[PDB]
Amino acid sequence: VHHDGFQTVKATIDWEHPMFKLYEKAKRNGKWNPADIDFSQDQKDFASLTSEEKISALPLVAGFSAGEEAVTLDILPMAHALARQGRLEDVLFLTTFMHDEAKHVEMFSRWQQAVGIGQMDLSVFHNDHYKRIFYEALPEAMNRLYADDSPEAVIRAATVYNMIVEGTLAESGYYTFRQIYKKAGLFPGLLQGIDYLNMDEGRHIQFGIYTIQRIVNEDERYYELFIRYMDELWPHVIGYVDYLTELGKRQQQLARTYALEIDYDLLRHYVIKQFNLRKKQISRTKR
Amino acid sequence: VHHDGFQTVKATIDWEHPMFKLYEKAKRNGKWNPADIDFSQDQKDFASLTSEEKISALPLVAGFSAGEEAVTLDILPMAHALARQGRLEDVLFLTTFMHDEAKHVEMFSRWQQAVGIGQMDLSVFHNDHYKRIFYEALPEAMNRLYADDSPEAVIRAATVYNMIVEGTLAESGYYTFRQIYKKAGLFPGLLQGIDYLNMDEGRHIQFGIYTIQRIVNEDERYYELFIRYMDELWPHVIGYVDYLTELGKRQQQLARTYALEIDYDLLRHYVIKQFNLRKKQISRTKR
Ligand SMILES: CCCCCCCCCCCCCCCC(=O)O
Ligand SMILES: CCCCCCCCCCCCCCCC(=O)O
Ligand SMILES: [Fe+3]
Ligand SMILES: [Fe+3]
Ligand SMILES: [Mn+2]
Ligand SMILES: [Mn+2]
Ligand SMILES: [Mn+3]
Ligand SMILES: [Mn+3]
């Protein structure tokens, strides 16, 4: 459908827009290139491991690799819906968001290739709860925006994508990676990547907060929708976390070898902490 | 609609894909930031000019600023359609494409702000032919892909976007900018930007060639569609070029002041040359 005019011909970019400022920060802080990461020590580490230890790391990598790919594809409808609303600064920022995720897909896929498991099908570590979030609920909520960009729809899309998938699951996965392999001195390449991902993620979550809050600011009853949508997905969040925890407990050879007292109870509490603090970053009353 | 699986969980990125290689080149060659360009001399230049000279530059900037904004918005449906086809490497590359265009919008809008014309509405220099390409034909061809991603539709989208708007009009505009203001020693900031744009553009056009050719490679009769779609838009291309040429001739004070023998006949021939050579970059027979 036709353009009726262009903001940067009639006027200029709104230089003070929060999303323009986040876009600028993304350009400054987003120069890292996965192709520069040295994975040579990672290959050696992985080879040194026993088959039982080798397995221990793959479920987490399987969750991340599909997660990065899902969000790379499923962010597009948000960019479209905000473009159609004429929110040019949000779109400029979202171009940095989409490119970040592309790099994240690249980073895990390079690690898999390097350590020799590229040919292995890691879908076996996606249980029903994970599939429910990433194979279904995420793409349903985002694709909805193509035909329905109501405030309700935009809040639900930002909630599933930015507050749950990124704000709860990704954040807890970054924490878990450090708690386990950083301790062990294992996979330095991967951990360098994880640090870069976690830095990008900060901006992704801030987009989600900004988006949900500006809708809540119009009608304080959207706050209730936000809480309700968070709570609808919790059972799948913890159900995936529980499945990963059970696998961890059934395969403890890596932990013993590397003297890691892996506290699954503390990881679980971190997830619960993440979830609850994302709720608190949205104020029911106009902020 | 649901994801049935993820390529980087079942396998890896196809590292040898031409679009993965272009993505890698985009990361290496795409670090420039419009926010780093020093526009101070540009502000002084523009102020030094008479009102008659001031005007001389604005039609070209008006065409570019709206063009950059149009393509930033209108590339999204291509990314979607290729995502839905599972072409992961094309999508990774398209994230660099979208971010480039965002920077291009930013660059012209920063120049406008800096030289003091941000508040001026430059839509007056968009004639009917320009509107036909940028306000209508471009968004029609791209948006079509949301409901119709047939090879015919994809070829028409790549033809209007990559071969005409970028491959013919943008390329000729870059040439024109140099021919005129580089000669004059004017607007060094803007010309630094133009050089960066023109470097990005090379990859954008190569995506379009790759896309059209891989469809032509399946059925050599798509070649005819490509030629026909090129020829359908030519009258608007030259009709905009003629309008810009007429404005140039009616306002020659900048040319006289700066001793520029501006050859509008040579610019026009460059446009014709661009158009004809984009045709030649598509081979009817399997390449
Ligand atoms: C053992 C404790 C469980 C910790 C939680 C593990 C969550 C794994 C994360 C996989 C999905 C990652 C989502 C990517 C989001 C993004 O890239 O923006
Ligand atoms: C005086 C001779 C005429 C020369 C032709 C002028 C064309 C002006 C270009 C304006 C549209 C630019 C399109 C941007 C494409 C992109 O950013 O990929
Ligand atoms: Fe993210
Ligand atoms: Fe371009
Ligand atoms: Mn269950
Ligand atoms: Mn005419
Ligand atoms: Mn990510
Ligand atoms: Mn451009």
Q: Which CATH number belongs to the domain containing residue A209 in this structure?
A: 1.10.620.20
Find out whether B136 and B181 touch, Cβ atoms under 8 Å.
no
User: Is residue B94 packed enough to be buried (19+ CB in 10 Å), middle (13-18) or exposed (0-12)?
Assistant: buried
Residues with Cβ within 8 Å of residue B163, at least 6 apart in sequence:
B205, B208, B212, B230, B278
Q: Which residues of B touch A11 (CB under 8 A)?
A: 118-119, 121
Residues with Cβ within 8 Å of residue B224, at least 6 apart in sequence:
none
Q: Which residues of A touch B118 (CB under 8 A)?
A: 11-12
Of A155, A194, A153, the residue nearest A176 (C-alpha):
A194
Phi/psi-derived region of residue B187, left when phi > 0, alpha when psi is between -120 and 50, beta in every other case:
left
Residue B30: both structure tokens together: 């795409």
Residue B117 CA, ligand 4 centroid: distance in Å: 24
B62 vs A31: CB contact, 8 Å cut-off? no
User: Is residue A73 packed enough to be buried (19+ CB in 10 Å), middle (13-18) or exposed (0-12)?
Assistant: buried
Cα angle value A179/A185/A191 (rounded, 5°):
65
| Buried/exposed code over B246-263 (b: 16+ C-beta within 10 A; e: otherwise) | ebbeeeeebbeebebebe
> Which amino acid appears at position B257 of this protein?
T
Task: State residue A50 phi and psi, 5-degree precision.
Answer: -70, 165
Cα angle value B200/A27/A88 (rounded, 5°):
80
Q: Which domain holds residue A215?
A: 1-287
Is residue B167 within 6 Å of ligand 2 at its C-beta? Answer: no
Q: How many domains does chain B have?
A: 1
Residues with Cβ within 8 Å of residue A170, at least 6 apart in sequence:
A64, A67, A197, A201
Scan for tokens 């026909």, then name that residue: B228
B6 vs A66: CB contact, 8 Å cut-off? yes
| Buried/exposed code over A49-61 (b: 16+ C-beta within 10 A; e: otherwise) | beeebbebbbbbb
Find out whether B141 and B161 touch, Cβ atoms under 8 Å.
yes
Kindly identify which residue of chain A lies nearest to residue B84, measuring between CA atoms.
Answer: A73
Q: How far is Cα A135 from Cα A230, in angstroms, rounded to an integer?
A: 18
Of B11, B123, B146, the CB nearest to A5: B123
Q: How far is Cα B137 from Cα B135, in angstroms, rounded to an integer?
A: 7
Residue A266: both structure tokens together: 């503390």
Scan for tokens 């793409």, then name that residue: A139
What is residue B32's three-state secondary structure? coil
Of B65, B95, B112, the CB nearest to A98: B95
Residues with Cβ within 8 Å of residue A52, at least 6 apart in sequence:
A251, A253, A254
What is residue B219's three-state secondary structure? coil
Q: How far is Cα B80 from Cα A222, in angstroms, rounded to an integer?
A: 29
| Among A58, A65, A68, A107, residue to substitute to test ligand 1 (most atoms within 8 Å of Cβ) | A68
Q: How far is Cα A137 from Cα A144, in angstroms, rounded to an integer?
A: 11
Residue A22: both structure tokens together: 């986040």
B201 marked ligand binding residue: yes
Scan for tokens 């704000």, then name that residue: A167
A109 vs B5: CB contact, 8 Å cut-off? no
Angle between helix axes B222-250 and B58-74 (nearest 10 degrees) is 150
Experimental method: X-ray
Residue B114: both structure tokens together: 């800096």
Residue B6: both structure tokens together: 């993820």
Find out whether A40 and A113 touch, Cβ atoms under 8 Å.
no
Of A263, A152, A122, the residue nearest A215 (C-alpha):
A152
User: Is residue B158 packed enough to be buried (19+ CB in 10 Å), middle (13-18) or exposed (0-12)?
Assistant: buried
What is residue A54's three-state secondary structure? helix
* DSSP code for B3: -
Residue B148 CA, ligand 7 centroid: distance in Å: 30
User: Is residue B4 packed enough to be buried (19+ CB in 10 Å), middle (13-18) or exposed (0-12)?
Assistant: exposed
Residues with Cβ within 8 Å of residue A279, at least 6 apart in sequence:
A226, A227, A230
Residue A199 CA, ligand 3 centroid: distance in Å: 10
Find out whether B154 and B95 touch, Cβ atoms under 8 Å.
no
> How many other C-beta atoms can be found within 10 angstroms of the C-beta atom of residue B276?
11
Q: How far is Cα B68 from Cα B55, in angstroms, rounded to an integer?
A: 21
Find out whether B251 and B56 touch, Cβ atoms under 8 Å.
yes
* DSSP characters over B102-162: HHHHHHHHHHHHHHT-TTS-GGGG--HHHHIIIIIIHHHHHHGGGT---HHHHHHHHIIII
Residue B184: both structure tokens together: 């004059």
Of B16, B100, B95, the residue nearest A103 (C-alpha):
B95
Is residue B64 within 6 Å of ligand 2 at its C-beta? Answer: yes
> How many other C-beta atoms can be found within 10 angstroms of the C-beta atom of residue A88?
24
Cα–Cα distance list, B154 to A76, B127, B151, B171, B224 (Å):
18, 28, 5, 22, 14
Q: How far is Cα B124 from Cα B127, in angstroms, rounded to an integer?
A: 8
Of B79, B105, B139, the CB nearest to A3: B139
What is the largest distance, in Å, between two alpha-carbon atoms of chain A? 66
> Which amino acid appears at position A125 of this protein?
F
Angle between helix axes B40-48 and B188-216 (nearest 10 degrees) is 110
Query: What distance in Å separates residue A226's CA from the closest CA in chain B?
Result: 23
3-state helix vs strand vs coil in chain A, percent to 5: 80, 0, 20
Q: How far is Cα A148 from Cα A197, in angstroms, rounded to an integer?
A: 31
| Among B58, B159, B168, B176, residue to substitute to test ligand 2 (most atoms within 8 Å of Cβ) | B176
**DSSP H helical ranges for chain B:** 7-10, 18-29, 40-48, 51-56, 58-74, 76-84, 88-115, 128-131, 138-143, 151-158, 171-177, 183-184, 188-216, 222-250, 253-257, 264-280
Q: How far is Cα A100 from Cα A111, in angstroms, rounded to an integer?
A: 17
